[PDB]
Amino acid sequence: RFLKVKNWETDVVLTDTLHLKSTLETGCTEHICMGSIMLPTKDQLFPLAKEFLDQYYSSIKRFGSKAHMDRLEEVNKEIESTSTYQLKDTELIYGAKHAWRNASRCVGRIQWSKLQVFDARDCTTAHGMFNYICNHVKYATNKGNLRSAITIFPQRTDGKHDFRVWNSQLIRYAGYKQPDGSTLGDPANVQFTEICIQQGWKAPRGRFDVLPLLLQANGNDPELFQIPPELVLEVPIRHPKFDWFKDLGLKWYGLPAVSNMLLEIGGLEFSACPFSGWYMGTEIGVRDYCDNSRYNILEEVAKKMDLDMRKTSSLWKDQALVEINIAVLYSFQSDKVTIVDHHSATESFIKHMENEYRCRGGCPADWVWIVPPMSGSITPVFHQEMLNYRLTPSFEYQPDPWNTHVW
Amino acid sequence: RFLKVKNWETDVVLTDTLHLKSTLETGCTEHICMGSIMLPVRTKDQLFPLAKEFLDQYYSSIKRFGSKAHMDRLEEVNKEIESTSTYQLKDTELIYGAKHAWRNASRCVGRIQWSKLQVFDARDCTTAHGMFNYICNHVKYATNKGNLRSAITIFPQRTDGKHDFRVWNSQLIRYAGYKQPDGSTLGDPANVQFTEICIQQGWKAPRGRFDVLPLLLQANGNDPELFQIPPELVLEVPIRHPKFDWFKDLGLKWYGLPAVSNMLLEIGGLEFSACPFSGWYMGTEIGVRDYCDNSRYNILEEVAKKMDLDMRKTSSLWKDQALVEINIAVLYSFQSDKVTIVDHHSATESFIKHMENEYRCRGGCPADWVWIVPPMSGSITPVFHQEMLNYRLTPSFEYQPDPWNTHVWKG
Ligand code: HEM
Ligand code: HEM
Ligand SMILES: Cc1cc(N)nc(C[C@@H]2CNC[C@@H]2OCCNCC(F)(F)c2cc(F)cc(Cl)c2)c1
Ligand SMILES: Cc1cc(N)nc(C[C@@H]2CNC[C@@H]2OCCNCC(F)(F)c2cc(F)cc(Cl)c2)c1
Ligand SMILES: C[C@H](O)[C@H](O)[C@H]1CNc2nc(N)[nH]c(=O)c2N1
Ligand SMILES: C[C@H](O)[C@H](O)[C@H]1CNc2nc(N)[nH]c(=O)c2N1
Ligand SMILES: [Zn+2]
Numbered sequence: 001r002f003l004k005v006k007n008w009e010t011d012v013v014l015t016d017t018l019h020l021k022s023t024l025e026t027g028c029t030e031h032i033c034m035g036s037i038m039l040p041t042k043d044q045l046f047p048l049a050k051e052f053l054d055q056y057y058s059s060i061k062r063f064g065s066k067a068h069m070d071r072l073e074e075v076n077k078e079i080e081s082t083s084t085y086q087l088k089d090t091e092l093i094y095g096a097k098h099a100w101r102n103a104s105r106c107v108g109r110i111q112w113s114k115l116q117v118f119d120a121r122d123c124t125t126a127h128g129m130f131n132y133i134c135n136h137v138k139y140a141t142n143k144g145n146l147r148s149a150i151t152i153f154p155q156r157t158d159g160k161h162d163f164r165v166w167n168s169q170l171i172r173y174a175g176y177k178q179p180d181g182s183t184l185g186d187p188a189n190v191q192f193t194e195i196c197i198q199q200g201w202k203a204p205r206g207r208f209d210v211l212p213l214l215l216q217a218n219g220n221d222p223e224l225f226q227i228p229p230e231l232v233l234e235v236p237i238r239h240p241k242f243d244w245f246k247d248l249g250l251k252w253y254g255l256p257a258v259s260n261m262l263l264e265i266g267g268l269e270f271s272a273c274p275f276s277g278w279y280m281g282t283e284i285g286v287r288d289y290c291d292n293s294r295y296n297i298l299e300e301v302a303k304k305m306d307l308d309m310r311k312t313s314s315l316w317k318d319q320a321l322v323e324i325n326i327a328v329l330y331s332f333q334s335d336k337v338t339i340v341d342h343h344s345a346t347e348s349f350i351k352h353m354e355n356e357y358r359c360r361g362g363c364p365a366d367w368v369w370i371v372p373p374m375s376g377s378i379t380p381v382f383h384q385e386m387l388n389y390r391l392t393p394s395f396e397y398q399p400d401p402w403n404t405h406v407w
Numbered sequence: 408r409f410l411k412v413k414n415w416e417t418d419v420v421l422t423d424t425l426h427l428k429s430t431l432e433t434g435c436t437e438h439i440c441m442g443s444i445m446l447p448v449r450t451k452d453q454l455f456p457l458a459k460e461f462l463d464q465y466y467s468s469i470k471r472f473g474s475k476a477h478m479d480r481l482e483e484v485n486k487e488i489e490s491t492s493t494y495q496l497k498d499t500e501l502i503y504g505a506k507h508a509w510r511n512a513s514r515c516v517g518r519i520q521w522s523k524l525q526v527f528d529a530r531d532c533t534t535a536h537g538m539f540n541y542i543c544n545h546v547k548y549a550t551n552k553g554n555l556r557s558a559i560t561i562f563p564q565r566t567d568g569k570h571d572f573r574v575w576n577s578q579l580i581r582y583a584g585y586k587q588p589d590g591s592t593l594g595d596p597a598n599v600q601f602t603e604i605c606i607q608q609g610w611k612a613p614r615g616r617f618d619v620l621p622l623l624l625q626a627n628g629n630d631p632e633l634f635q636i637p638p639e640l641v642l643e644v645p646i647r648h649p650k651f652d653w654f655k656d657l658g659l660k661w662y663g664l665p666a667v668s669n670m671l672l673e674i675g676g677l678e679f680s681a682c683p684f685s686g687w688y689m690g691t692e693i694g695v696r697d698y699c700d701n702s703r704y705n706i707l708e709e710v711a712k713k714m715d716l717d718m719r720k721t722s723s724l725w726k727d728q729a730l731v732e733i734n735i736a737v738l739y740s741f742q743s744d745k746v747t748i749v750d751h752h753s754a755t756e757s758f759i760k761h762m763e764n765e766y767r768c769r770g771g772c773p774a775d776w777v778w779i780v781p782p783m784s785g786s787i788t789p790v791f792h793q794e795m796l797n798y799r800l801t802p803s804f805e806y807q808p809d810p811w812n813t814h815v816w817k818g
Pocket of ligand 7: 028032033034035435436439440441442
């Protein structure tokens with residue numbers, strides 16, 4: 001019931017109580033651990049609402065007070081009558097900040113309380129969604145000085161009227177499958193890029209074509225908009241020592257902004273809720289550039305470094321991987337665009353864990369996602385035991401709209 | 408029930424039915440995952456089921472399930488248990504058990520080799536001295552002048568838990584650690600407390616940076632005894648770098664033979680508390696963990712300091728740079744000396760091929776992702792992108808408490 005986590009490099013031991021207030025299910029049983037799997041009515045709604053409003057009034061040192069009871073009463077009357085309810089602004093802000101606080105896969109949660117929340121619940125059309133999103137992008141980007149933000153569109157109703165951003169991130173490069181069999185641009189986005197062109201996007205057919213936004217309002221068929229080019233901050237990738245690096249022609253965008261997730265607050269579901277912070281360097285330099293199914297650039301870089309590529313044991317992949325990452329960080333830093341390296345980010349997360357064990361009694365963390373994809377064991381998180389569990393308010397992953405939607 | 412795993416790089420999907428034969432618990436629940444937690448006397452009553460399950464597994468493997476030999480063996484074990492409260496494995500059963508414990512070891516990336524394992528039956532051993540001799544033979548056989556061969560030595564099983572055989576060392580070969588009055592450590596920090604016990608037991612410590620520890624061996628629940636492994640049996644590799652000639656001047660070496668001695672082998676309910684086993688190294692264990700953990704030899708700074716990296720900001724990735732070079736050195740060194748080593752690219756690709764083969768032929772392969780993914784270069788190895796299911800099959804190896812915490816000293 002009270003569980004220990006031990007750090008194997010420091011011997012520091014933390015006691016978790018927070019897990020007892022664990023809402024959802026992990027995917028694991030007593031018989032089988034699924035820790036590495038990517039995807040492991042009016043009745044239900046009121047306990048859900050009450051549970052949230054209880055943590056809310058608790059957080060503002062007002063538990064069991066008249067204002068608390070009053071609100072619980074009000075929301076109950078609204079549900080019985082309308083079959084749903086509306087969050088107060090303060091509740092909405094608190095809930096978004098907490099969905100981030102509870103994101104067990106996020107290493108950057110030291111920043112959780114600095115989240116600017118944009119209430120787009122009055123939005124009604126795709127063009128409105130677009131105006132809201134351009135504003136989110138410009139705000140968050142801040143000429144390179146990135147600020148965290150989320151924009152929250154209208155909540156689910158009968159489920160026939162959802163708002164969705166069809167893009168998985170607000171900003172991403174196009175992918176096209178080519179005559180000669182290989183892939184131009186980002187292979188991750190081949191499918192999406194095609195749905196855009198079939199919806200009428202005129203693709204430049206390049207390698208770093210910023211995709212158009214595909215926006216669904218009120219369960220309507222989605223529409224295409226180009227983000228204003230001057231809003232998309234991009235970074236040319238060079239190396240502080242390899243003059244030839246620039247010649248690969250690599251760029252990446254400054255703003256990471258996940259736009260396919262579902263925000264659940266007090267039982268209510270915000271299906272379109274694009275959010276953003278800033279990059280950890282390894283995301284671009286390890287995953288985006290080096291994943292085999294991504295830009296897959298290790299071979300080309302290794303070659304330019306003239307390494308021994310004939311045997312795996314010369315560790316040429318490993319050498320090239322590091323230089324690529326040095327270059328990502330160098331470039332962002334030189335262009336004064338916010339970026340964190342895996343060392344400083346994981347250091348921050350350990351500090352954040354300790355604060356959360358101290359102040360909150362725990363911190364849900366998913367070790368498989370928290371430990372960076374290169375240099376694991378030289379980051380502190382590697383040696384930190386973590387417990388993973390599902391708390392609410394939360395972000396949840398949801399089916400691609402094109403699977404669900406009918407035209 | 409069927410369970411599917413996906414590989415996110417290749418989109419291959421696999422179906423696990425084997426988890427249905429899972430016995431022990433994981434530590435996880437529907438409410439909590441403990442997947443990153445390191446550690447998440449019997450009676451007759453609980454023992455015959457365990458014996459039965461095992462012998463059923465053994466008799467299936469040889470295509471004799473249900474045969475008279477199978478039934479006679481069931482009755483004979485049954486009878487042995489009712490009459491003595493335990494039973495004795497046949498050689499063939501011991502071999503098969505010890506092989507399947509390795510096969511079922513979900514934290515082992517090396518398991519493609521599980522079927523080629525040399526089993527040494529040491530169930531006739533009675534004394535510590537006898538234990539030493541068995542262990543020297545194991546080491547010489549496994550080492551094989553650098554052409555390493557996997558092997559296990561199996562000492563007598565637990566009886567009443569008062570007469571346990573134990574190897575007090577966590578591995579047969581490891582370097583001493585000595586904690587200094589100034590708060591620094593000479594040698595391996597991991598081995599400090601164990602070095603202390605050894606010295607209290609009368610070991611004459613050389614007090615150098617790479618002193619091979621003496622075996623401390625417990626037979627039949629007796630107080631443990633010190634033995635020096637014959638140094639001509641301890642193969643060691645001096646560490647040098649192919650391009651950097653100052654690398655050798657750091658003074659580093661390592662032993663070639665990784666040999667885990669502190670684990671508990673369970674077969675058909677029987678508990679073998681001393682079953683030292685050995686394979687060969689994956690380079691990252693030495694290069695990443697042994698040399699670069701802050702709590703171990705911690706050499707990252709000296710290497711980067713000598714490489715003249717920019718060490719004033721983490722974002723220069725100086726630690727990452729030095730880490731690669733150290734790892735290049737260890738593989739280069741082992742290879743130049745003709746000591747068996749595998750790099751993590753090669754070992755994880757072999758593991759993926761083993762894992763798929765097992766799904767086809769066995770119906771699954773329990774694997775622990777947190778352990779199988781190498782401690783550097785995670786995502787450029789195929790295991791990173793591989794969904795895995797972790798569960799516990801027997802026979803199995805288990806962690807067991809260090810013996811100096813439990814031992815009743817007889818004086
Ligand atoms: C401010 C700097 C931030 C950093 C450095 C950061 C870091 C990261 C990283 C490295 C990941 C792993 C993602 C992946 O590998 O795809 C991640 C996942 C995630 N983070 Fe953050 N984060 C930041 C801000 C945010 C914000 C503002 C939110 C939401 C309000 C958020 C919520 C999440 C969620 C929900 C995931 C899991 C996404 C998924 O399952 O695909 N993070 N974070
Ligand atoms: C053939 C060469 C082998 C290689 C390259 C290999 C690879 C590895 C590696 C890299 C680990 C992680 C060790 C750590 O991080 O502490 C490991 C764990 C393990 N291996 Fe192997 N292995 C080999 C042979 C064997 C053999 C012969 C056995 C037993 C018969 C075995 C059973 C285990 C067990 C039980 C673990 C978990 C150890 C623990 O929980 O502390 N392996 N393997
Ligand atoms: C099937 C599936 C499930 C799931 N939960 N996530 C994914 C998305 C997969 C999971 N890792 C790769 C891909 O997403 C990349 C986007 N996520 C993080 C980010 F890059 F956008 C990001 C980074 C950062 F530093 C800050 C923020 Cl706010 C966002 C796929
Ligand atoms: C608390 C705890 C639990 C547990 N199950 N294991 C450990 C042992 C911990 C786990 N990593 C650090 C310490 O291992 C020392 C032995 N390392 C494995 C090996 F070197 F012996 C080895 C490597 C190889 F490739 C092949 C073999 Cl056969 C053996 C500690
Ligand atoms: C907390 C965590 O489980 C612990 O640091 C683990 C992580 N993964 C590991 N993986 C391997 N192969 N060996 C280890 O010692 C560890 N340590
Ligand atoms: C199968 C496995 O879960 C998958 O490869 C995961 C591993 N860890 C990850 N970690 C992060 N941060 N992001 C990811 O996309 C993944 N992918
Ligand atoms: Zn689990």
